[PDB]
Amino acid sequence: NCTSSSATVHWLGDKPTYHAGVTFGLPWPQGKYRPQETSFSLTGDTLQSWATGYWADGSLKWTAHAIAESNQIYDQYTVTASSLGCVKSSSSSSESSAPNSSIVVTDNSDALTVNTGEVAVSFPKGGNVIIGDIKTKSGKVIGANGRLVLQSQDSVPDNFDNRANSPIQYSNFDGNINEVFVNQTSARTLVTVRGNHTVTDGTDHDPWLPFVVRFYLYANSATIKVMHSIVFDGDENDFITGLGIRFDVPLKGEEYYDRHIRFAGVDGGIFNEAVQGITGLRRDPGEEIRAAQFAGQKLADTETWEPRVSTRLKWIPTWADYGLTQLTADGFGLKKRTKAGQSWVNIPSGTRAEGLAYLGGATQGGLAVGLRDFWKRYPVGLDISNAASDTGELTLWLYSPAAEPLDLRPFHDGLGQDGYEDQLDALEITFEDWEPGFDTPYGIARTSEVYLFAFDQTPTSDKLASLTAYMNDPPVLVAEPKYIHETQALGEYWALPSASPAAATLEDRLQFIFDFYKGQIEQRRWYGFLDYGDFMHTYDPDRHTWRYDVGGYAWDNSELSPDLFFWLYFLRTGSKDAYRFAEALTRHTGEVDVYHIGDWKGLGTRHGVQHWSDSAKQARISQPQYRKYFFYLSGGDERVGELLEELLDTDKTYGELDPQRKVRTDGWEPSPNSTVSFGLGTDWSGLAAGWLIEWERRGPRWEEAKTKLTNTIAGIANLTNGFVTGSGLYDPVTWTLGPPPSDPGNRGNVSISHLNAVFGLPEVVSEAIAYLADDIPKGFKQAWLDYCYYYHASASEQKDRYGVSFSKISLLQAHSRLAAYAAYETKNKTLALRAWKDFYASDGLLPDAPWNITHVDGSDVLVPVDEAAWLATNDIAQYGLAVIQNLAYVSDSLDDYQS
Amino acid sequence: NCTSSSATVHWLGDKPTYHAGVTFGLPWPQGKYRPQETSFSLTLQSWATGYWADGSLKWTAHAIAESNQIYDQYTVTASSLGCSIVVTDNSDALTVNTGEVAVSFPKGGNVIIGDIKTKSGKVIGANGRLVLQSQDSVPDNFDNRANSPIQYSNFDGNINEVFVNQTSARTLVTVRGNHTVTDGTDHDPWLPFVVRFYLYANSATIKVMHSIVFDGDENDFITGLGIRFDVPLKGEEYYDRHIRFAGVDGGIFNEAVQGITGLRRDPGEEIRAAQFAGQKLADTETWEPRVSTRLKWIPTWADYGLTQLTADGFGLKKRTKAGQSWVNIPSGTRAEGLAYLGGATQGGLAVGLRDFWKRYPVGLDISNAASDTGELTLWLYSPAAEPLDLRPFHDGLGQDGYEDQLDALEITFEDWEPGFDTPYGIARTSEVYLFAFDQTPTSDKLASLTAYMNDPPVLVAEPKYIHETQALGEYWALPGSASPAAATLEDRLQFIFDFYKGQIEQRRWYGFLDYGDFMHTYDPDRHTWRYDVGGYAWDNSELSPDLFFWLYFLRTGSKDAYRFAEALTRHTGEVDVYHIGDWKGLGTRHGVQHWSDSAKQARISQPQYRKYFFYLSGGDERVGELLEELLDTDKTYGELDPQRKVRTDGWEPSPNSTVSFGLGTDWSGLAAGWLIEWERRGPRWEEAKTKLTNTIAGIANLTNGFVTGSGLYDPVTWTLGPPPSDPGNRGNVSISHLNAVFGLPEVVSEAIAYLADDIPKGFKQAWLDYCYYYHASASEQKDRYGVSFSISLLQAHSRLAAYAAYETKNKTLALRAWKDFYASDGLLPDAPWNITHVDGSDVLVPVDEAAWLATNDIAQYGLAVIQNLAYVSDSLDDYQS
Numbered sequence A: 001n002c003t004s005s006s007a008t009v010h011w012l013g014d015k016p017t018y019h020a021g022v023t024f025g026l027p028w029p030q031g032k033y034r035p036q037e038t039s040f041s042l043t044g045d046t047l048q049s050w051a052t053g054y055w056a057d058g059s060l061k062w063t064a065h066a067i068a069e070s071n072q073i074y075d076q077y078t079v080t081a082s083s084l085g086c087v088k089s090s091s092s093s094s095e096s097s098a099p100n101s102s103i104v105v106t107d108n109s110d111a112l113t114v115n116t117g118e119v120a121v122s123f124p125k126g127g128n129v130i131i132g133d134i135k136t137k138s139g140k141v142i143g144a145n146g147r148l149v150l151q152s153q154d155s156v157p158d159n160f161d162n163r164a165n166s167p168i169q170y171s172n173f174d175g176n177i178n179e180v181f182v183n184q185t186s187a188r189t190l191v192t193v194r195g196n197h198t199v200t201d202g203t204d205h206d207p208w209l210p211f212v213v214r215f216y217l218y219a220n221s222a223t224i225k226v227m228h229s230i231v232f233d234g235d236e237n238d239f240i241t242g243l244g245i246r247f248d249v250p251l252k253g254e255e256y257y258d259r260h261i262r263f264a265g266v267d268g269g270i271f272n273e274a275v276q277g278i279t280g281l282r283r284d285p286g287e288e289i290r291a292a293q294f295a296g297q298k299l300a301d302t303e304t305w306e307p308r309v310s311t312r313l314k315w316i317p318t319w320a321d322y323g324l325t326q327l328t329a330d331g332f333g334l335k336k337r338t339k340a341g342q343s344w345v346n347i348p349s350g351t352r353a354e355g356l357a358y359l360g361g362a363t364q365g366g367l368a369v370g371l372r373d374f375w376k377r378y379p380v381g382l383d384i385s386n387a388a389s390d391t392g393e394l395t396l397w398l399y400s401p402a403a404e405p406l407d408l409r410p411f412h413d414g415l416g417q418d419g420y421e422d423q424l425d426a427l428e429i430t431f432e433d434w435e436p437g438f439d440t441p442y443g444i445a446r447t448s449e450v451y452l453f454a455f456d457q458t459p460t461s462d463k464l465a466s467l468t469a470y471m472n473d474p475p476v477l478v479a480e481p482k483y484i485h486e487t488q489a490l491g492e493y494w495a496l497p498s499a500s501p502a503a504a505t506l507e508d509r510l511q512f513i514f515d516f517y518k519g520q521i522e523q524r525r526w527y528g529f530l531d532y533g534d535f536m537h538t539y540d541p542d543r544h545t546w547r548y549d550v551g552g553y554a555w556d557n558s559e560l561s562p563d564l565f566f567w568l569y570f571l572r573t574g575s576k577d578a579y580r581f582a583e584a585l586t587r588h589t590g591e592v593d594v595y596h597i598g599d600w601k602g603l604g605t606r607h608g609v610q611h612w613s614d615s616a617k618q619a620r621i622s623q624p625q626y627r628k629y630f631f632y633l634s635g636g637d638e639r640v641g642e643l644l645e646e647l648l649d650t651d652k653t654y655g656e657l658d659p660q661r662k663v664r665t666d667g668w669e670p671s672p673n674s675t676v677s678f679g680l681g682t683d684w685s686g687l688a689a690g691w692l693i694e695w696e697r698r699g700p701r702w703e704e705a706k707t708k709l710t711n712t713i714a715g716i717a718n719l720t721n722g723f724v725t726g727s728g729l730y731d732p733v734t735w736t737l738g739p740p741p742s743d744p745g746n747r748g749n750v751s752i753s754h755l756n757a758v759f760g761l762p763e764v765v766s767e768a769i770a771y772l773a774d775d776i777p778k779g780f781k782q783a784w785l786d787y788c789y790y791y792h793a794s795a796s797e798q799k800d801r802y803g804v805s806f807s808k809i810s811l812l813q814a815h816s817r818l819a820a821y822a823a824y825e826t827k828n829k830t831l832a833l834r835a836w837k838d839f840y841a842s843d844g845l846l847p848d849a850p851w852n853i854t855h856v857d858g859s860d861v862l863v864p865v866d867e868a869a870w871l872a873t874n875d876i877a878q879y880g881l882a883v884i885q886n887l888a889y890v891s892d893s894l895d896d897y898q899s
Numbered sequence B: 001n002c003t004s005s006s007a008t009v010h011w012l013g014d015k016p017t018y019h020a021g022v023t024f025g026l027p028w029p030q031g032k033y034r035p036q037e038t039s040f041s042l043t044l045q046s047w048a049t050g051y052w053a054d055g056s057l058k059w060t061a062h063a064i065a066e067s068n069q070i071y072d073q074y075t076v077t078a079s080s081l082g083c084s085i086v087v088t089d090n091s092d093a094l095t096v097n098t099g100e101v102a103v104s105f106p107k108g109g110n111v112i113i114g115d116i117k118t119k120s121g122k123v124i125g126a127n128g129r130l131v132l133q134s135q136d137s138v139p140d141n142f143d144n145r146a147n148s149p150i151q152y153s154n155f156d157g158n159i160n161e162v163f164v165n166q167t168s169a170r171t172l173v174t175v176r177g178n179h180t181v182t183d184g185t186d187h188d189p190w191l192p193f194v195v196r197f198y199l200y201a202n203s204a205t206i207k208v209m210h211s212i213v214f215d216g217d218e219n220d221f222i223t224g225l226g227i228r229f230d231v232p233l234k235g236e237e238y239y240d241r242h243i244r245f246a247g248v249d250g251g252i253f254n255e256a257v258q259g260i261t262g263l264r265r266d267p268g269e270e271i272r273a274a275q276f277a278g279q280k281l282a283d284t285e286t287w288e289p290r291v292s293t294r295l296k297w298i299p300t301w302a303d304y305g306l307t308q309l310t311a312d313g314f315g316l317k318k319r320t321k322a323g324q325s326w327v328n329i330p331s332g333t334r335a336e337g338l339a340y341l342g343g344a345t346q347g348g349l350a351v352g353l354r355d356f357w358k359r360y361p362v363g364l365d366i367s368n369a370a371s372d373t374g375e376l377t378l379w380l381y382s383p384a385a386e387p388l389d390l391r392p393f394h395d396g397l398g399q400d401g402y403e404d405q406l407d408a409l410e411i412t413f414e415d416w417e418p419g420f421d422t423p424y425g426i427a428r429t430s431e432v433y434l435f436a437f438d439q440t441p442t443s444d445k446l447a448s449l450t451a452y453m454n455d456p457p458v459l460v461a462e463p464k465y466i467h468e469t470q471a472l473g474e475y476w477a478l479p480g481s482a483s484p485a486a487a488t489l490e491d492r493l494q495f496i497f498d499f500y501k502g503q504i505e506q507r508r509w510y511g512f513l514d515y516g517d518f519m520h521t522y523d524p525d526r527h528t529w530r531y532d533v534g535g536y537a538w539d540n541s542e543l544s545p546d547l548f549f550w551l552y553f554l555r556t557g558s559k560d561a562y563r564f565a566e567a568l569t570r571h572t573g574e575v576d577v578y579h580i581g582d583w584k585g586l587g588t589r590h591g592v593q594h595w596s597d598s599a600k601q602a603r604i605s606q607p608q609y610r611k612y613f614f615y616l617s618g619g620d621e622r623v624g625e626l627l628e629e630l631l632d633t634d635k636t637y638g639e640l641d642p643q644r645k646v647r648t649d650g651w652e653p654s655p656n657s658t659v660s661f662g663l664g665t666d667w668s669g670l671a672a673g674w675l676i677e678w679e680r681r682g683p684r685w686e687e688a689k690t691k692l693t694n695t696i697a698g699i700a701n702l703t704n705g706f707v708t709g710s711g712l713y714d715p716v717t718w719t720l721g722p723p724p725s726d727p728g729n730r731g732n733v734s735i736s737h738l739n740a741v742f743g744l745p746e747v748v749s750e751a752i753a754y755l756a757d758d759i760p761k762g763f764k765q766a767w768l769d770y771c772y773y774y775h776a777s778a779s780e781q782k783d784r785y786g787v788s789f790s791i792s793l794l795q796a797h798s799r800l801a802a803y804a805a806y807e808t809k810n811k812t813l814a815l816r817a818w819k820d821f822y823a824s825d826g827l828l829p830d831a832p833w834n835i836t837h838v839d840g841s842d843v844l845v846p847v848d849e850a851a852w853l854a855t856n857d858i859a860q861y862g863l864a865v866i867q868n869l870a871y872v873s874d875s876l877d878d879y880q881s
């Protein structure tokens, strides 16, 4: 007999005018549905399912779902879930369905084809071509020989004058395929292609700059979503200069006046030309034949037009190449030329190109290609080539050659810092912890969301403007905030927006903080091929910039869990903008700010002037927990899935590198075949986050990840001082966690750090406590409750319990949330009030702060800005978390405190 | 016995907050003041710029020194007979000294300013040098760079001649040369230059008119063009060395090598706020010692680069030193194009380029600020850009011989030919400024100076007085509207002026060579000017818009008008015209490129187009040079035939053997050029007057006169007789609608008035006839003449009928002039007369438009309004039936 429950999914924003199939996630109550013994139906007012994560007990926690492209787009989609008991007490009779369209593949020795019903595309299993051909339903080829291009240079000149005496040696590469994979379903098929960049033209090289590219194809869709990621493994002499994706468009049978070129301009504008310019000649071929060219239709046979024009094609020139380049965030240049050899002709251009180009004909068809958030990921470009020839070229430049080349070398020389002592003394003035050869981008990554669109004939510009919009704002379905909370499938430590007017203005300040930071991206132009998605760490109130050039006060690189603030803000609110902002952050931080290959695979790089400048390579930047929310909302984004998997090697890095090497007083140092020393707060919050997630996903290494998390949780519980213990040692063969170097025989150590609880520890711990349920090692929960309570007890209370008082605690507003927890967990209203007091009257932001922005115009600044010189990013992140977590755990004591 | 009058001069826009000396012109009525014996007092530097025929003063020029006292009006009194900068000259270099600044210019070498010095004797800048970089080839596309290695060559402007007009308030310093190689492909000297330095008494700002003629191959691709200076800054502590960049809309960027703001430790709110203000920071002893030690770990920012490679977006970047990466700097849209380098104690320099972001691609660099001497470059063309591709935009399309060329003309509207797609001999004048400071100034001063150069102030005469003097035309009068029909004409001129002024911004008519011009005709299907079909693209003065705009300013005094007209005349005079070689004096005709079209002609180069901007401004010395250049326009008619290819004869040109001129299409421009050199009394005036006054007399004795087609000009005797296919007179009658639209009625109108009683024969009739007869009845085109004409631009030629009507006193004609204006071709009173906005997927960027008009229409519509109102507004009331 039956268990069945429904859960509704809404468009992130407005009901979109078009979508090309979407994937969403739903959560489910702990203990309610067994996998593969639960079916899922869909009501849209008037469904392809799979599990992404499971509960402790093995029931479904998070699933993911996929709907085909449709012209029916509903205000809401409701997903019912019936168990097997439902269909197995029947004597009623379903009709059996049959979708109007449904994907079919052909797996092959040579290639692999995927037929959506509107296109068929081929995926070579080897070679230097990712997509062999893209076919309409007609059977005709619309684009083909899709390939990844990369150019480099060997050197870069000191300054412009120096070009004369320094020679740049250029070299070209082809994306070489090495594996192809498939996740086939009726509704959507993921094609994952992994490989390398290998040489073809210019100087010889090792194969390098790896890539994985994911092609997403939905039933009934000529749209193909492309998630292109590369790990960077260049060295001192590897300057990327172009990075791109190129397709051949046929055009062979096509009268030039019937071949059309389009680019997206600004605010949903389209550029509309053909290879041969019949509009605005001296002589007219007729209202209707001009009107039809502009509209991308096939023109009548030449014997129908006033022959003063028809007898004179030959003299009307023929435009082979077009070029859109976006090298700043504010202006794009656009040009064309007749053929390779002539000067180009400047076309009237504009500000911020929406980043799509189409190339085809009214008969031969064509494809279009584009990059989501195009101008925000400058320097980018869109190229057409050989449009007057037999086979045309259409290319998306992810990094335009027209730009200055990608320069990832260290921004300074070391400033003469010799040894650890100087390194730490640099940190006291610039807030940077430098080390020679740590200022490196070796192993960082970047993903880009690229769309391809196939066309039978030239589409209308209104259809082009639409797809261009589509791409830049890809429709997203998301579960209800209320329901995501009920399930408890994404943490206990947040809840929806109370009655207290104090609670009310706390929400208003979260919206202030958010509105500011969103506004501050545009105003400070936090855009760029690698930069976009991140923001900075502290303001310079004298200069009125953010501190882009002062060591650690520049790029924020997930310092004090801004990720958590913004994702928890989304979970509560359901705001589009909250998501869109957190999406962009998780895409940067997850990819740029963590090392994916190397001896540091697992670590991420602390805030710096570059995103890899600082020597602090630590787990608290890579921190899986920061990705956890977006993995599940989104329906297991398979890239972010890979990124969480990567991180399951973090623990190994403590054999290589100690983050305390410079400050550790107990002269420890790691050796091979020995126990390694990580932190019990910041370091372990990352390890344990990653181990929880693999356990939850039931991945290849789940039994392992489960084991490590339980052993380490018992270890901390068996330590003596628990988390107040500084930070023990860990055996990589036995996976157990023992006391630190200076306490061999649990006669407890004390090391306190204000950082230990602001990089996901509360979140990870609660989740883990919940997961292990009864199986939890005895006294872990107490050890954690201790840490929570004692942090901001009296100094006597601390001395009494721990020997010494906690002399270096700060971030009290930040830590207010640890009270709010232990308050809830112990049903102690005096400890609840500790939260509200430490939040309302200690450090961070404070209720009587300005809580407004000032405008700064005129000669003090390059360009007009708004500023709030009174807040820093560390302030807004931990404030935000405190607001959400204190309201979560102790709403009921807030009015009590106020009164 | 005394004759004294007065004449008042006004700022162009609002009263300026600040100027740096100003030169301005004043016209004077005919036969009023004798040169060398008429004194001038303000409430004053003076000199003659044009003279009347009887030698009396026609246009003067005047300079006032830089002054903190700045007044609303300035009044100059002229007085008949009846009633301070210091230059030194060592045997090496000349130095001008204004009171504030002292600049030394070498007489030779690859350095053009030696050093700049503040009254205190302190060197703030040094080694002013013209920079250039070229490359030999450009890749076809971006994949082509590993299989086509590119060889760069570096040059720097060698000096050849150095002239000095010195006076008390003002001191011009004119330095000619070309770019002599240093490192790179052993290249011959090329790219000749004229740089004019204006230095006024009192100022420490310098006006710098940098002119340059392109004289290079299909292989000479300019990557970078700069003006470069060394800032000393030796014993200035790092934290006391400042950097600025003007950004957007009165903004200024403000750092220093070695940041003391933004740090973990705070030295002291006073200290920080000094660095931001650009002041010498207090002793290290007064600092907080956690900041004052540790200075060795705070990095030093040597290099700074601001590129503006589009019209809407600039970048900004910094580098500790070369070898390390750059760090991106919060940037924005449209840099106003100044930069400062210098120090609190050591002082320093600031360079800037007027209209910086409009003349893209441009950069401003600062280098070696961590060193003992720092570089400060203004790049006039940015090495960051693609390298200036002056080649032809097509390979001819399979066109072989005149048959094809002319046939293509019937579809794409361009007259092609091989070898004529060449920019050899075009020029371009960039207006630069330099600013010398004893100490890093207030960044509110840098803002006001960046405002200074992007809108340098202008002192111009009263329109009522310029009309009264008759120094520029009698063919224009002030709006003073008395009918309802008049004011709607005035409104329409204002409609036209706005629409055009906006189209520059909307259609992005911006760029190194592009900025100043507009386009010819619109494409109503695409919603775009015809930027890619032959002669429908760049308008290169066709049908005399230069002549409409500069007239509109004369009448109004609108600052906008002046500025629009200015930037045009700064383009058409320089980039469309040829300055060296065989075609020197001919302008290329309207095309996709400014030099694409094979029809190189005199109608474009027409000196009348620059006449007004020359005299207003007080004889701009670069425009003065150009007006001379055009005196060798006639030399080109034994070198090229504008009527070849359209010629059914066997004829072919050689020098010193007679040629045919269209009396409007060719003569109007020569007459104009000659009448100017005469007016000015230049190195060739006597020549010019004889050539002009001959060719005038020549016409009056052609039996039919202007009604005869072309003339027969003898380069040896400088005379003009009847054309081939009519020797011995008897009579020729050949009419083209193109004659009266390219200057004719303004040159004839001015020459007649300039000559008075020395006017030959009945030239005045020979003119009057063509005016009356151009659109009389075909029956009256027998009664006189005997061969009924074959009529083409009637609204435009309405001006000519109006001229005759005033000169005759003939209201029959005046009413016909109005009936052609309102009821013939051209625009038409019932026309749409509004703009339509266009957006969505129909265009790239949203835009306004009127496809019911084109640039031909508006120019001749505009001239027609102004001239029919001036001559025959009386008849407008009476007309309205």
Ligand SMILES: C[C@@H]1O[C@@H](O)[C@H](O[C@H]2O[C@H](C(=O)O)[C@H](O[C@@H]3O[C@@H](C)[C@H](O)[C@@H](O)[C@H]3O[C@H]3OC(C(=O)O)=C[C@H](O)[C@H]3O)[C@H](O)[C@H]2O)[C@H](O)[C@H]1O
Pocket (backbone or CB within 6 Å): A433, A552, A606, A616, A618, A659, A660, A663, A754, A755, A809, A810, A811, A874, B264
């Ligand atoms: C192990 C490793 O060691 C260093 O590489 C580095 O530690 C330094 O940076 C820390 C960090 O990045 O968070 C940290 O900083 C404090 O906390 C942050 C939030 C503040 O921005 C800092 O001002 C700093 O504050 C303390 O210092 C000050 C101050 O004004 O300087 C005032 C407060 O009262 C103090 O709490 C460490 O303290 C630094 O050693 C790595 O982070 C670390 O993991």
Ligand SMILES: C[C@@H]1O[C@@H](O)[C@H](O[C@H]2O[C@H](C(=O)O)[C@H](O[C@@H]3O[C@@H](C)[C@H](O)[C@@H](O[C@H]4OC(C(=O)O)=C[C@H](O)[C@H]4O)[C@H]3O)[C@H](O)[C@H]2O)[C@H](O)[C@H]1O
Pocket (backbone or CB within 6 Å): A282, B409, B415, B535, B589, B599, B642, B643, B646, B792, B856
């Ligand atoms: C003689 C010499 O040779 C040619 O290379 C070229 O002539 C051609 O271009 C002219 C030009 O201005 O560029 C003229 O076009 C002339 O007048 C302008 C105002 C008009 O656009 C034309 O109107 C001709 O236009 C048409 C038409 O094509 O439908 C009909 C009208 O009645 C005409 O006014 C245009 O003729 C020449 O006519 C043209 O042959 C050089 O410019 C020329 O000096």
Ligand SMILES: [Ca+2]
Pocket (backbone or CB within 6 Å): A534, A555, A556, A557, A558, A588, A589, A592, A593, A611
């Ligand atoms: Ca970052």
Ligand SMILES: [Ca+2]
Pocket (backbone or CB within 6 Å): B517, B538, B539, B540, B571, B572, B575, B576, B594
């Ligand atoms: Ca031009």
